Amino acid sequence: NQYDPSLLQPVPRSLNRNDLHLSATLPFQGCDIWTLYELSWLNQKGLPQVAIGEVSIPATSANLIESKSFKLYLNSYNQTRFASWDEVQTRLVHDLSACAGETVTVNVKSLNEYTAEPIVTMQGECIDDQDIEIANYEFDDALLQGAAQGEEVSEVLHSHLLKSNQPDWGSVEIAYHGAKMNREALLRYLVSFREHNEFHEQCVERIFTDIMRYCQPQSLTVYARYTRRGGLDINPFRSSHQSAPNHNQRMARQ
Amino acid sequence: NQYDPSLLQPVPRSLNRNDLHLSATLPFQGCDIWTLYELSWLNQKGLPQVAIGEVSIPATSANLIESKSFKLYLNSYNQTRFASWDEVQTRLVHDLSACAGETVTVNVKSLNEYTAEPIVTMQGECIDDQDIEIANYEFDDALLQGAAQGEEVSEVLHSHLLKSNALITQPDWGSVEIAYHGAKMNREALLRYLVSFREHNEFHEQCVERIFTDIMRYCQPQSLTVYARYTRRGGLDINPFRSSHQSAPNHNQRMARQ
Ligand SMILES: NCc1c[nH]c2nc(N)[nH]c(=O)c12
Numbered sequence A: 001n002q003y004d005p006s007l008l009q010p011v012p013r014s015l016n017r018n019d020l021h022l023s024a025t026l027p028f029q030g031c032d033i034w035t036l037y038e039l040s041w042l043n044q045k046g047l048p049q050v051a052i053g054e055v056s057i058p059a060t061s062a063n064l065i066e067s068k069s070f071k072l073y074l075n076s077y078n079q080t081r082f083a084s085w086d087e088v089q090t091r092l093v094h095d096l097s098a099c100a101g102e103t104v105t106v107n108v109k110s111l112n113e114y115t116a117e118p119i120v121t122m123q124g125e126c127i128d129d130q131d132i133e134i135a136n137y138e139f140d141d142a143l144l145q146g147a148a149q150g151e152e153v154s155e156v157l158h159s160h161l162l163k164s165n166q167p168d169w170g171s172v173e174i175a176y177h178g179a180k181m182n183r184e185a186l187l188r189y190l191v192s193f194r195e196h197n198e199f200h201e202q203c204v205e206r207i208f209t210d211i212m213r214y215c216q217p218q219s220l221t222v223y224a225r226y227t228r229r230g231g232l233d234i235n236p237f238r239s240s241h242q243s244a245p246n247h248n249q250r251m252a253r254q
Numbered sequence B: 001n002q003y004d005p006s007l008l009q010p011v012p013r014s015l016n017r018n019d020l021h022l023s024a025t026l027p028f029q030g031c032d033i034w035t036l037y038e039l040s041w042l043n044q045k046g047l048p049q050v051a052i053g054e055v056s057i058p059a060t061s062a063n064l065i066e067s068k069s070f071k072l073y074l075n076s077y078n079q080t081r082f083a084s085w086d087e088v089q090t091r092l093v094h095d096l097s098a099c100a101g102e103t104v105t106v107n108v109k110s111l112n113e114y115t116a117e118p119i120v121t122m123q124g125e126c127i128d129d130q131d132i133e134i135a136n137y138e139f140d141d142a143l144l145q146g147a148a149q150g151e152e153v154s155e156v157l158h159s160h161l162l163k164s165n166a167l168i169t170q171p172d173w174g175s176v177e178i179a180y181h182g183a184k185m186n187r188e189a190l191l192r193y194l195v196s197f198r199e200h201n202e203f204h205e206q207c208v209e210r211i212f213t214d215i216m217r218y219c220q221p222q223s224l225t226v227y228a229r230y231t232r233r234g235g236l237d238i239n240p241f242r243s244s245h246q247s248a249p250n251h252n253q254r255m256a257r258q
């Protein structure tokens, strides 16, 4: 099967946001950064081309794009001849923007651009090394109740323990300014996502809205980077004060 | 549920090797390097642990391990408490060696070991940049016929254009590095040959062996190494290494698409 933009499946963002009981206007801004590790097509002469794509979808887009459908859409490029790399990037912008409902940004880079590019970790302190027992993996947001009692602080915390539903795996970076967060509670909360079902996008939005309503920080940023499924990974960034992360560099599991 | 070694499914190497007309005594030595990006389990206290696994399976093993079973087997660790990372590494070795049929080597690394680790590309000259037309995608090994007419040389070549499917599937993507000492290979022929794999259905390990045996039969190098690095599926990638003279690749460093 060749190029087929109708393979893309929009999912209205409002659908699962309704269950976060949001306000009229969004409490956050941000974007979903997708890495397309498998991007490949044929040039005009039938010679395969390979590239890595990077896509940025604004969090204000009416829809997100269902990842399997994104994967299938990309696969439809595989056996398709395009006259150039510019054409490929342009069609990607067109189709993805059409689907999302807002202009999407797309970078199509040759593999060579990645040579020597670092695997990175996240900012701040990892909260994952704690001596605690967890017997119960059921999602409990109330785990955050009275979570930030501390001194007013600006800090960045991260965790590699985000898991969801076969399993999805992710790391999450939480930067905030407010009463200092209890690290055990935060860890327990994050771990409680383990058995639970939502899109990565929806999960980041849940974590943001839960932290905001329980811990009431002055400013908050929640940024997760998930390992790829079907050659694509999703990296939702949601912030009270900030538009996007500085770069797309991959983490160890990605 | 809980840790379950029975999920592992071996696939005998003999299947494809018979297909490639090999005897019990192999033209090559080597191993299959797997990277396990998703390895996770619970510590004794129920706190999730995450690691990247690195598994080397000797090419002399009776069996390979079917990737999906391997993934499912690994998932069974997710909700299981293990006493230590040491116990995890031990269980992996024991179970994977039993499935493969020979002692497998396993390294379980913390995520932190990868910080600042650079992405690498393969060695030598990329053959991918050629202005040529591909008329059809059917696998053709005869594309290598008369492919090394050149003066005697030692060189390393690579291509990012390896693609494959399998009956069990969704395309697989890979890069392949070929180092040889022999009559110099025509790069157009080699590139075409590799591209002709696009619609091919076989496992990564089988592909690499096919490429090695094809190059050996058609190009008759004095020594040959074929090393492919494939993108992951289900959290696992396979990097088969096959050489006349060498037992293993120098490292597991990941490539752009991996
Ligand atoms: N992770 C499950 C999943 C399936 N399809 C998806 N599409 C998007 N955009 N995000 C997701 O998290 C998923």
Ligand SMILES: NCc1c[nH]c2nc(N)[nH]c(=O)c12
Residues within 6 Å of the ligand: B064, B065, B066, B067, B068, B165, B166, B168, B172, B202, B203, B204, B205, B233, B238
């Ligand atoms: N990629 C196809 C595939 C499915 N299962 C597999 N198991 C192994 N060992 N190798 C493979 O290439 C595959």
